[PDB]
Amino acid sequence: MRECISIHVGQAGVQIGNACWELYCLEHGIQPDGQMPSDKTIGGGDDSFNTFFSETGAGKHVPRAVFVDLEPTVIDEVRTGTYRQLFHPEQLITGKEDAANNYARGHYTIGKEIIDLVLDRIRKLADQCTGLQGFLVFHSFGGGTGSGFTSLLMERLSVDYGKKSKLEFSIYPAPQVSTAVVEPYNSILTTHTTLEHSDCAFMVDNEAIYDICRRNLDIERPTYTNLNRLISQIVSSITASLRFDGALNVDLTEFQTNLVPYPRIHFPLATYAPVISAEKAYHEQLSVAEITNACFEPANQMVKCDPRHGKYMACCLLYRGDVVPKDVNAAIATIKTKRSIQFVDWCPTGFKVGINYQPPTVVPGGDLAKVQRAVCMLSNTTAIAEAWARLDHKFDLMYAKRAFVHWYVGEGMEEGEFSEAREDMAALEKDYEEVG
Amino acid sequence: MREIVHIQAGQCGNQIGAKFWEVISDEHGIDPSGNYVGDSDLQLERISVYYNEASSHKYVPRAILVDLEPGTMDSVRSGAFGHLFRPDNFIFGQSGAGNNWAKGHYTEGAELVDSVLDVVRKECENCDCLQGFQLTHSLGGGTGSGMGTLLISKVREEYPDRIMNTFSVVPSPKVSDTVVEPYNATLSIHQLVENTDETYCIDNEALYDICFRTLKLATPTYGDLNHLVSATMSGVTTSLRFPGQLNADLRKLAVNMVPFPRLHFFMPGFAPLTARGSQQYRALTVPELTQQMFDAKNMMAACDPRHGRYLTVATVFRGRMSMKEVDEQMLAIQSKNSSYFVEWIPNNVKVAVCDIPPRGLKMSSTFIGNSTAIQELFKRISEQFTAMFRRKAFLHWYTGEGMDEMEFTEAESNMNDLVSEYQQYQDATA
Ligand SMILES: COc1ccc(C[C@@H]2NC(=O)/C=C\C[C@@H]([C@H](C)[C@H]3O[C@@H]3c3ccccc3)OC(=O)[C@H](CC(C)C)OC(=O)C(C)(C)CNC2=O)cc1Cl
Ligand SMILES: Nc1nc2c(ncn2[C@@H]2O[C@H](COP(=O)(O)OP(=O)(O)OP(=O)(O)O)[C@@H](O)[C@H]2O)c(=O)[nH]1
Ligand SMILES: Nc1nc2c(ncn2[C@@H]2O[C@H](COP(=O)(O)OP(=O)(O)O)[C@@H](O)[C@H]2O)c(=O)[nH]1
């Protein structure tokens, strides 16, 4: 009874979406030929899985998402991958030439000649909706397509739909899988023009995902199928709230309300704990108290920043299977050991919990195996300023001697944009640092 | 990607690029008859980068060869893989192109620029989208330097959007019969700095130095050095030719590499130095590749980078290889040489890995750097020019051919300013 639309931009976005949509199939029992025996095959739905699949009279359960790429190299792969028959006759978006690591080329030159088609597609999809909450866009700060076009898309959407919210999932690109060197300019130039049209954005750092996969997954060569699968698992876990059924954090509005205090501070940090290694059959057993104890370890968060230096806003949680709220209360009492915990004086505290009575789903033939309990703490820390400071150092270095600047100026951008965005990010990091 | 148009100028260009076509055509496993021999799709994933289908869906290289000395056509059609090309772009002159500028730059050649634009547009009609251009030439003689700069400017006018890349060969006193070279070299690089996007300094001085002091060949011929350069430029092209993780492209290579708006002269290098062999080889393994990648006597510019700084770096490794090991040694090399590299762009030393071995060697790589050491080469060329110029010499040829003294003076002003720019960016701080 509340529709939802997602959208994928860029190679990273489309790959993550590929890795996520089949997880989404698995979770509800949806299968490329599945039928979910409790339905009428004609709109049989309006449950929490209706928000994505707008199932047709053919009992197909077609989704609500489109994929964007300036030059077909991954969107084709999903067009001829595994769930081929799962998408409409050329509903997807294919271009002819990428922005090539150039924020400007996607922000002023190329996208400004393809965007109208994207908006037409988004509107045409939304018309079939009835109660849309907002958009969930997938992009990255690395390239110029998944960044310049994303910011331009933000502007266009906020122009056409300002009332509705639109949650974001982003990647803070790492030197380890750095496919460019002009990422930091794109990152600043995207965060600066994101705030005024953003509401709540999640960053998942490929530094962090790479570290997790290399360390606790026994993989030394993280292709774009390993890190991609891990991130898909995290995204499914976070959106399970609205996805499976009703509990804490039903709606995107509710995301904002219980997460974001201050519209300049809307980058929640997500932690996880169950990192099942591999097909390893037997290591030991597991306890809910154990995983909630682990969800405080700095090594197990989706973005590298040590929060024992700062204060939290609102530390929500989710769980899968084996309800035991008394154990949860004991867990809060234990973590109250105040060795690495804090809250903020002005507003009281709430560790809202919502339980899903389904054990977590796993990739069948992947680098994981099925477990029974799961949990994901979305702690809106003040420590998330570490990432911005780290990226500011590099942006300042590169802008010291005006490196690469021509590749942006000579395409429809001015010189003052760089300076003003740097100042704006300085104000933003000041706005984080002052809270306390 | 989109298609690439290749342009070949003069005797040096025709010979060097014909050998390069042979090298890659063996690498992509295509027969002289256009017959297909490759045994996997990974060979033809990016065959459309260069080669175009025939009426028999037979893949044909797309390139153009330009010169005015009409004796080159038979040289084209007498190589081992020479007859491979389309019998439509063997367009050449008819009365020689004596190594004088403004003869191919102003006097003639300017009459056949219509012909060359006609042929390049004709074969880019069959190109669904255009990526860039490959002009191979040298900095001495009309056909060569002068035609190259004229072509560069013309296509820059007609296609201001796409990329423009070229290979530069700088003639040297060590192997050079004529002596009107330094004038040609400076007159060339003046057009080249302001009119192209990136360029490779395939030098002869360093080439001869290393070939005679380690490879120790008696008579460096147009055979041996042609082989060396064809191999190295094949190695450079591999990254686009291969599918890579550092899945770089011409525009992407420019964006990643290009540090300033006038410093786009690269220093192609190669770690496992190779002569004309017969058997498989004497074996080489990883740490040897690591060391010989960045030695002092393996590049193509007579400079020691430890006397300068890198703006950026790039490599493309070859053969079955341990990626984690490679990353480990690269991290060490960026760790144990802190002062060696510029502090302006961290995360500059990019790395990629390829799979198909070179057709003859097991484990190799391809170094495509961008240093501040290139000022030594440019200073050398400019000093020899001005030594030839302080008193006039053959300059009556140029003046009566169309230039004036002011063009020479401004070419030197531009080159010395460029050297000042490289010096400046070579002495930055934090
Ligand atoms: C001080 O007196 C000296 C005299 C000679 C030498 C070395 C002497 N010099 C040169 O000519 C070198 C460059 C001058 C250019 C001049 C500057 C270009 O405009 C030329 C031109 C070409 C065609 C038509 C009109 C004009 O000429 C040439 O390249 C011509 C090629 C042509 C004529 C086939 O000749 C040769 O290429 C040679 C003679 C085989 C090359 N060899 C030499 O041992 C050294 C000194 Cl120091
Ligand atoms: N899918 C995926 N992408 C990643 C990962 N790590 C980094 N990336 C990013 O993937 C991006 C490639 O897509 P884009 O950023 O859109 O690249 P582009 O040059 O703008 O355009 P395309 O290459 O056509 O997509 C780079 O910016 C990388 O930083 C990863 O683990 N998975
Ligand atoms: N043919 C040839 N010439 C080379 C090579 N390397 C350097 N050169 C030099 O390039 C110059 C030849 O210029 P060229 O293109 O013949 O001028 P043109 O007479 O106008 O065609 C000579 O100085 C050669 O020494 C090579 O591999 N092949």
> Which of these CATH numbers, 2.60.120.620, 2.40.50.140, 3.40.605.10, 1.10.287.600, describes B376-426?
1.10.287.600
- Is A140 annotated as contributing to ligand binding? yes
Give me the number of domains chain A comprises: 2
Angle at A353 between CA A352 and CA A355, to 5 degrees: 160
Residue B265 bridge partners (DSSP): B199
Same domain, A243 and A167: yes
Say which amino acid occupies B333: I
Domain containing A11 — which CATH number? 3.40.50.1440
Cβ of B256 and A220 within 8 Å?
Answer: no
Nearest to A96 among B129, B260, B261 (CB): B129
Q: How far is CA A266 from CA A200, A215, A256, B347, in A?
A: 5, 30, 8, 29
Q: Is B144 annotated as a binding residue?
A: yes
Q: In chain A, which residues have their Cβ closer than 8 Å to the Cβ of B427?
A: none
> Where is the domain boundary, A269, A290, A311?
A269
Helices (H) and strands (E) in chain A, counts: 14, 10
CATH of the domain at A289: 3.30.1330.20
In terms of domains, do A185 and A258 share one? yes
Domain boundary among A367, A386, A405: A386
User: Cα dihedral sign for A344, A346, A348, A351?
Assistant: negative
Enter the DSSP assignment of A42: S
Residue recorded with tokens 């300068």 = B308
Domain B270-375 annotated CATH 3.30.1330.20:
yes
- Containing H/E element for B135? strand B130-136
| Chain B residues within 8 A of A97 when measuring between CB atoms | 2, 129
Cβ atoms B16, B208 nearer than 8 A = no
**Among candidates B255, B258, B259 on the partner chain, residue whose Cβ is nearest the Cβ of A100:** B255
Does A398 contact B344 at a Cβ distance shorter than 8 Å? Answer: yes
- Across the interface, whether the CB atoms of A397 and B249 are under 8 A apart is answered no
Alpha-carbon gap: B281 to the closest alpha carbon of chain A (Å): 30
User: Which atom of ligand 3 sits closest to the CA of residue B97?
Assistant: 20
Which ligand 3 atom lies nearest to the CA of residue B176?
25
Ligand 1 in contact with B180 (CB < 6 A)? yes
A404 touching B (Cβ < 8 Å): yes
Residue A346, min C-alpha distance to chain B (Å): 41
Contact B347 A178 (CB under 8 A): yes
Chain A CB within 8 Å of residue B143 CB = no
Flag whether A419 is in a domain. no
Shared domain check, A140 and A187: yes
Is there a single domain that holds both residue A165 and residue A289? no
Alpha helices in A336-370 (DSSP H): none
Q: Are residues A298 and A265 in the same domain?
A: no
A234 and A321 co-located in one domain: no
DSSP string, A84-142: GGGS-TT-S---SS--TT-HHIIIIISGGGTHHHHHHHHHHHHHT-SS--EEEEE--SS
Q: Please, which experimental method was used?
A: cryo-EM
Name every protein residue with a CB atom under 6 angstroms from any ligand 3 atom.
B 10-12, 15-16, 97, 99, 138, 140-144, 169, 171, 175-176, 181, 204, 222, 225-226
Residue appearing with tokens 């072509």: B151
Residues A265 and A277 in one domain: no
In a domain, A435, yes or no: no
For residue A420, is it within any domain? no
Q: Which two tokens stand for residue B406?
A: 């002011």
Residue from B140, B112, B123, B139 nearest B196 by CA: B139
C-beta separation of A12 from A139 below 8 A: yes
Beta strand extents in A225-314 (DSSP E only): 269-270
A178, A182, A400 member nearest B344 (Cβ): A400
Whether residue B11 is annotated as binding a ligand: the answer is yes
- Distance separating alpha carbons of residues A256 and B253, to the nearest angstrom: 41
Residue A253 within any structural domain of the chain: yes
Q: Do B344 and A220 touch (CB under 8 A)?
A: no
- Does B10 carry a binding-site annotation? yes
Listed residue (B187, B225, B178) closest to B203, CA to CA: B225
The reply to whether B345 touches chain A by the CB within 8 Å rule is: yes
Are both A243 and A294 inside the same structural domain?
no
- Tell me chain A's radius of gyration from C-alpha atoms: 21
Distance A146 CA to ligand 2 centre (A): 7
A327 and A356 housed in the same domain:
yes
* Residues of A labelled catalytic: 254
CA distance A120 to chain B (A): 26
Distance in Å, CA B165 to ligand 3 centroid? 19
B258 contacts A404? CB cut-off 8 A: yes
Upper half-sphere CA count for residue B54 (Cβ side, 13 Å)? 13
Backbone angles phi, psi at A300, to 5 degrees: -115, 25
CATH of domain B3-269: 3.40.50.1440
* 3-class SS of residue B3: strand
User: SS3 for B172?
Assistant: strand
Q: Is residue A407 part of a domain?
A: no
Tokens matching residue B127: 């190109």
**A313 contact partners, CB below 8 Å, separation of at least 6:** A259, A261, A265, A344, A347, A379, A380, A381, A382
CA–CA dist A208, A225 (Å, integer): 16
DSSP assignment of B82-119: GGGS-TT-----SS---S-TTIIIIISSTTTHHHHHHH
Residues A84 and A216 in one domain: yes
Cα–Cα distance for residue pair B31/B54, rounded to 1 Å: 14
Residue A45 belongs to domain spanning? 5-269
Check: CB of residue B257 under 8 Å from CB of residue B249.
no
* Per-domain boundaries in chain B: 3-269, 270-375, 376-426
Cβ neighbours for A274, distance < 8 A, ≥ 6 positions apart: A286, A291, A360, A371, A373, A374, A375
First to last CA, chain B: 39
The answer to whether residue A401 sits within a structural domain is no
Both tokens of residue B32? Answer: 């002289």
Q: Is residue B371 a contact partner of residue B310, using CB atoms and an 8 Å limit?
A: yes
- Based on the number of CB atoms within 10 Å of its own CB, is A89 exposed (0-12), middle (13-18) or buried (19 or more)? exposed
A224 lines ligand 2 (CB under 6 A): yes
- The verdict on the CB of residue A100 being under 6 Å from ligand 2 is yes
Residues A172 and A278 in one domain: no
Same domain, A56 and A179: yes
